[PDB]
Amino acid sequence: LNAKVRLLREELQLLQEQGSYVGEVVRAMDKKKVLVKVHPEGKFVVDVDKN
Amino acid sequence: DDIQQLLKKINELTGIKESDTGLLAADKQTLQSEQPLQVARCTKIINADSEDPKYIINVKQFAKFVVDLSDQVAPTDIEEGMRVGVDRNKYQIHIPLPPKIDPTVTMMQVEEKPDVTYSDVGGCKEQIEKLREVVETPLLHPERFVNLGIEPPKGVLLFGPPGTGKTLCARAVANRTDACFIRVIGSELVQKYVGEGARMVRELFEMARTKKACLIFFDEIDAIGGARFDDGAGGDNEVQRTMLELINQLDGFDPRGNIKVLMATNRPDTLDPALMRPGRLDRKIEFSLPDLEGRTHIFKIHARSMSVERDIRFELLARLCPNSTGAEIRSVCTEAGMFAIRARRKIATEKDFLEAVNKVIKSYAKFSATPRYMTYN
Amino acid sequence: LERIKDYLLMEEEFIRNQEQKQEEERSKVDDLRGTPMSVGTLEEIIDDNHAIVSTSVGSEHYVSILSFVDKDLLEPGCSVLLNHKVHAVIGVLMDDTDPLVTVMKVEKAPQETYADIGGLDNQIQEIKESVELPLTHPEYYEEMGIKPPKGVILYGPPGTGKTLLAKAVANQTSATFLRVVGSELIQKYLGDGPKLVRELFRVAEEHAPSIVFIDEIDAIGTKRYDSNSGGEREIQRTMLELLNQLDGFDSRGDVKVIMATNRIETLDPALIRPGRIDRKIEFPLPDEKTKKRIFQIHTSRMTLADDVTLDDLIMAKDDLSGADIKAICTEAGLMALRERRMKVTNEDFKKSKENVLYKKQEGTPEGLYL
Amino acid sequence: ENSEKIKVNKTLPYLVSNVIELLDVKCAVIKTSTRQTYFLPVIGLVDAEKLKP
Numbered sequence A: 001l002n003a004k005v006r007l008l009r010e011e012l013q014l015l016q017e018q019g020s021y022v023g024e025v026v027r028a029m030d031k032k033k034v035l036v037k038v039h040p041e042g043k044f045v046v047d048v049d050k051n
Numbered sequence B: 001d002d003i004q005q006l007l008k009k010i011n012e013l014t015g016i017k018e019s020d021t022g023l024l025a026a027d028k029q030t031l032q033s034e035q036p037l038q039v040a041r042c043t044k045i046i047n048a049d050s051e052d053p054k055y056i057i058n059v060k061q062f063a064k065f066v067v068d069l070s071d072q073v074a075p076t077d078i079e080e081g082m083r084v085g086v087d088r089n090k091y092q093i094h095i096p097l098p099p100k101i102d103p104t105v106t107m108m109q110v111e112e113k114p115d116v117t118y119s120d121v122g123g124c125k126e127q128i129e130k131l132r133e134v135v136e137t138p139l140l141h142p143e144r145f146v147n148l149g150i151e152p153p154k155g156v157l158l159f160g161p162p163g164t165g166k167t168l169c170a171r172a173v174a175n176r177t178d179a180c181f182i183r184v185i186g187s188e189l190v191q192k193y194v195g196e197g198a199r200m201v202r203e204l205f206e207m208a209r210t211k212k213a214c215l216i217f218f219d220e221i222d223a224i225g226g227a228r229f230d231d232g233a234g235g236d237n238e239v240q241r242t243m244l245e246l247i248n249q250l251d252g253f254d255p256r257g258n259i260k261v262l263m264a265t266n267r268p269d270t271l272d273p274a275l276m277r278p279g280r281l282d283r284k285i286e287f288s289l290p291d292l293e294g295r296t297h298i299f300k301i302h303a304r305s306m307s308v309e310r311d312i313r314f315e316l317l318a319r320l321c322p323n324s325t326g327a328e329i330r331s332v333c334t335e336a337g338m339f340a341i342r343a344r345r346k347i348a349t350e351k352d353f354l355e356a357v358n359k360v361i362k363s364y365a366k367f368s369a370t371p372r373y374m375t376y377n
Numbered sequence C: 001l002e003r004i005k006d007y008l009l010m011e012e013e014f015i016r017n018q019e020q021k022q023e024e025e026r027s028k029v030d031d032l033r034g035t036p037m038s039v040g041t042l043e044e045i046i047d048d049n050h051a052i053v054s055t056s057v058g059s060e061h062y063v064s065i066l067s068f069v070d071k072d073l074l075e076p077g078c079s080v081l082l083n084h085k086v087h088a089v090i091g092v093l094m095d096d097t098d099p100l101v102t103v104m105k106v107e108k109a110p111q112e113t114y115a116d117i118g119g120l121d122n123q124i125q126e127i128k129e130s131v132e133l134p135l136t137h138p139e140y141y142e143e144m145g146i147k148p149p150k151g152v153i154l155y156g157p158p159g160t161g162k163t164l165l166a167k168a169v170a171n172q173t174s175a176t177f178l179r180v181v182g183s184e185l186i187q188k189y190l191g192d193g194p195k196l197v198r199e200l201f202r203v204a205e206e207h208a209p210s211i212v213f214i215d216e217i218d219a220i221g222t223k224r225y226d227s228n229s230g231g232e233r234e235i236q237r238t239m240l241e242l243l244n245q246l247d248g249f250d251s252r253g254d255v256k257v258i259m260a261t262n263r264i265e266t267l268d269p270a271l272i273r274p275g276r277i278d279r280k281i282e283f284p285l286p287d288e289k290t291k292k293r294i295f296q297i298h299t300s301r302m303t304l305a306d307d308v309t310l311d312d313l314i315m316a317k318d319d320l321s322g323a324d325i326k327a328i329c330t331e332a333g334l335m336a337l338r339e340r341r342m343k344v345t346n347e348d349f350k351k352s353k354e355n356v357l358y359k360k361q362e363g364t365p366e367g368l369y370l
Numbered sequence D: 001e002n003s004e005k006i007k008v009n010k011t012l013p014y015l016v017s018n019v020i021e022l023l024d025v026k027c028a029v030i031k032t033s034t035r036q037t038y039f040l041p042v043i044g045l046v047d048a049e050k051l052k053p
């Protein structure tokens, strides 16, 4: 039981990782490429994740 | 349901086919050298200093940067008031930059020639003559004006009822101008940033000044803020600044110099008084509804292409059109052919046009064209 | 229960749409291209291959181009794609139109051909000669010497189904159909909205034969009245750009415009002129013969009792629109379902007309007077 | 100090721009061309009297 609570804190090491930007997809193209505009910047072609 | 099944079976067959189907030296050595090659962001020089030059440059939004010249450059080649490229890492002017072309202004220039002769425009000899000596003769033969010591108007405003032919004449001038013709996109001049459009208008004149003798066609002048209510709300404040910038560059403190301005408006009354004032636009060539000789000529030019019996009387057809714009006369010719196509007769006859004359004018809700009143005979 | 086959066809079609590299050359380009690539405008072209590229950050550094497929496509105003870090032009310029323009294009038309419409046959003839006929048989127009009419306006009282003719054109058109409301140009930013009108037309030219529908044109262009209070609509600038696109220098290429207005008098004269609307189509409220065809079409796919008299409803009441006929047919079916009869009696149709027409009150004392 | 001063003026982050105001505890507030305002506890290498708001 003590291991579980400390493991939850070990899981909290995840909070350290930086958040990914939030953007809107203008359109999609083939070969795992999508055209997404960044919220305060400009159009970015991005590589899609396996998931 | 069986027929629906056949389509569903066809879709299933396509699904089986898709699943079954599933079951230059530039990209070589050059890339290895290219990735190390550094970038040089563009910036504009404003000044120079004695001894170490210490040229100070505004990047374009960043800051005034006191950057020394790069080691592999000639100090004379770097110049004050010259665009330059500064490497961010080395903070020095590695290579000077050529002056900005500003392509959007370059795009508005016609470049191509519209293929319309003055002959196609018809029923407005006087309007054509007025345009000829503000557009073609002063540029082609300036000597005659000099002999009387008379300056050309250097400005023209074409106004009239819609469909009269104002733009058609303008494209005809573009065909034989023999000088740069600069059609202006009215929407382009309005811009999201405050006074960004006003900057473009300065560029428009600067481009005009660089070329020798050019005519600028501000069609739809109303789009270019051609009014100056300038109310307290100042919703049009950005456009009003753009309009004033055009007015000052047009005339005052040295005007066009070699630029002739042609402006065409369906509604002349809306145009702002300062633009209407002459000097900015000396000539006021208003196009007018064509007279019976003009109405016959517009019918003849429009119908020359169409195949028709040789006995048709355009004079009767023009008379039947009491007050018709050139576009409506063109509409009668096209409509007359469409009736012949409906009856499948290759060669049209006078009757077809009369049916069209009723259709183009009387059938439209003019009311005056269609008579139910005995009143007058 | 043949519905299951139809539902399967729809699901299968979606699956088909869902189911719609070189050993060394592609891998080298994949290495050359950055994982993130930022697309930016091309400002200047230089022969050395290092060409100035404008960006949102405005870094215009001359950047080398190494495009395996082709690097000769570079043009001023092209949107080049650059590496996030190196900023070199990665390759062939990205070629996608603005998102708002993409929404207008329509690939599927729900309605079928002119068969659903009844009694607008003269109106159908005009739309066909201007839109369907020139494409199907181009030779006839050339032999006549006529250039096909390119613009049409459909003006009628509410519920005369002007839109239905447009939906029918979409069903049988080779041309790509862009369906844009006239009220879809409300861009708040100064500018942009007139530019959007330019964008719709440039796409139409790119798609070659195209039909443009602008329903409720009254909002985009009406009167061209002066600023007055000084609010300045800027809508007049938007209408002027549309007026420029239809016939304002240059040419319209092969793009046809269909526009629909409940009220045509309000529309400014310049927009409604030959050269922008060569052919004008008027939808009148249906008379008697037109009403008979519409009443039959609406009741064709429903249970009909022998007792029902379609002619009696049409002759007894005059003023009902084509849409009103459809509403009477839907209401009559609901009236029967209240009595739990799937079959529809004559009595149901008589009750239905009364319920649908309760908001239409017209006329004053103009009876004894004349 | 002179060698550092020469390097800093030459460097890209020099951002030469006008002082919004002059302050005393001998202090300055500068709005850079980047439009960012910074208060410096020490007015700088150049004389405080020499500097003009």
Ligand SMILES: Nc1ncnc2c1ncn2[C@@H]1O[C@H](COP(=O)(O)OP(=O)(O)OP(=O)(O)O)[C@@H](O)[C@H]1O
Binding pocket: B120, B121, B122, B123, B124, B160, B161, B162, B163, B164, B165, B166, B167, B168, B169, B264, B265, B266, B298, B301, B325, B326, B327, B330, C243, C247, C248, C249, C270, C275
């Ligand atoms: N006098 C004419 N001679 C020949 N064609 C004419 C004449 N007047 C009008 N047209 C026809 O009308 C169209 C020309 O219209 P134009 O380009 O001049 O714009 P406009 O309608 O006068 O301008 P605006 O919309 O600003 O009032 C073409 O179809 C052209 O053939």
